[PDB]
């Protein structure tokens, strides 16, 4: 159903839905691993389904409709603790590449595309443990897509090689993120 920001479990999948309070976002849980987000003139939000906690060898499948209009990402998305890390395996984005301004650290080939690897830092921002400073890890797919399979081990292993180490996993979902934009998406995870 349509729900307010929060986390929990639906139809055997963890979900997380977060927004910055701006308005203009509608998050809905569907049957099985499905969720939908429709947004119009939003702020920043992140929502999706998967697992709590994630693992470092999960093979994650996603399929659906992803129709951003503006700044938005479609990613395997999750956190670790000790160290506190927000990570992204970006499968699609709209008008803005999240690595713009970031230093490239390497590459990994996985699931039919090369990905570029970057580290960034968030300073005094919201997080799974409240206001914090923390690194983010990125794999950015060169050839976008809105359905597919992601072997997360390929990414985590490549990151690790580059000195990008993950701590104990927290949640791990397929998430739609928007950043002051509009769009519609409906994704089924497995
Ligand atoms: O991890 C997420 C970050 O990627 C996100 O950073 C914002 C991404 O959008 C940038 O704005 C773009 C600048 O370029 C053009 O002008 C675009 O139209 C803008 O959208 C912001 O500058 C970054 O802060 O922050 C949220 C975090 O979850
Ligand atoms: C964005 O950062 C905030 C994360 O959600 C918070 O998690 C910690 C809870 O105490 C807080 O109430 C939540 O808002 C969200 O998972 C990330 O996507
Ligand atoms: Ca795209």
UniProtKB/Swiss-Prot annotation:
Glycan attachment sites: 38, 61
Cell location: Secreted
Induction / repression: Induced by D-xylose, dependent on the cellulase and xylanase regulator xyr1. Repressed by glucose through negative regulation by the crabon catabolite repressor cre1.
Associated pathway: Glycan degradation; xylan degradation
Catalytic reactions of this protein: Endohydrolysis of (1->4)-beta-D-xylosidic linkages in xylans
UniProt enzyme class: hydrolase
EC code(s) of this entry: 3.2.1.8
pH dependence: Optimum pH is 4.5-5.5. Stable from pH 3.0 to 8.5 at room temperature and from pH 4.0 to 7.5 at 40 degrees Celsius.
GO biological process: xylan catabolic process
Gene Ontology CC terms: extracellular region
GO MF annotation terms: endo-1,4-beta-xylanase activity
Active site: 86 (nucleophile), 177 (proton donor)
Keyword field: Carbohydrate metabolism, Glycoprotein, Glycosidase, Hydrolase, Polysaccharide degradation, Pyrrolidone carboxylic acid, Secreted, Signal, Xylan degradation
Family: Belongs to the glycosyl hydrolase 11 (cellulase G) family.
Reported function: Glycoside hydrolase involved in the hydrolysis of xylan, a major plant cell wall hemicellulose made up of 1,4-beta-linked D-xylopyranose residues. Catalyzes the endohydrolysis of the main-chain 1,4-beta-glycosidic bonds connecting the xylose subunits yielding various xylooligosaccharides and xylose. The catalysis proceeds by a double-displacement reaction mechanism with a putative covalent glycosyl-enzyme intermediate, with retention of the anomeric configuration. Produces xylobiose and xylose as the main degradation products.
Name this protein carries in UniProt: Endo-1,4-beta-xylanase 2
Origin species: Hypocrea jecorina (strain ATCC 56765 / BCRC 32924 / NRRL 11460 / Rut C-30)
Portion held of the full protein: 35 to 223 of 223
């Amino acid at each position: 159903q349509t729900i307010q920001p929060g986390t929990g479990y639906n139809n055997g999948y963890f979900y997380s839905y977060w927004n910055d309070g701006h308005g203009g976002v509608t998050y809905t849980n569907g049957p099985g691993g499905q969720f939908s987000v429709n947004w119009s003139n939003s702020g920043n939000f992140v929502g999706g389904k998967g697992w709590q906690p994630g693992t470092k060898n999960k093979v994650i499948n996603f399929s659906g409709s992803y129709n951003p209009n503006g700044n938005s990402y479609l990613s395997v998305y999750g956190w670790s603790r000790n160290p506190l890390i927000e990570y992204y395996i970006v499968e699609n984005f709209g008008t803005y590449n999240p690595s713009t301004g970031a230093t490239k650290l390497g590459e990994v080939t996985s699931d039919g595309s090369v990905y570029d690897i970057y580290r960034t830092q968030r300073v005094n921002q919201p997080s799974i443990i409240g206001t914090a400073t923390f690194y983010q890890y990125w794999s950015v797919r060169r050839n976008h897509r809105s359905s597919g399979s992601v072997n997360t081990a390929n990414h985590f292993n490549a990151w690790a090689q580059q000195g990008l180490t993950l701590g104990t996993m927290d949640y791990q979902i397929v998430a739609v993120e928007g950043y002051f934009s509009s769009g519609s998406a409906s994704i089924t995870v497995s």
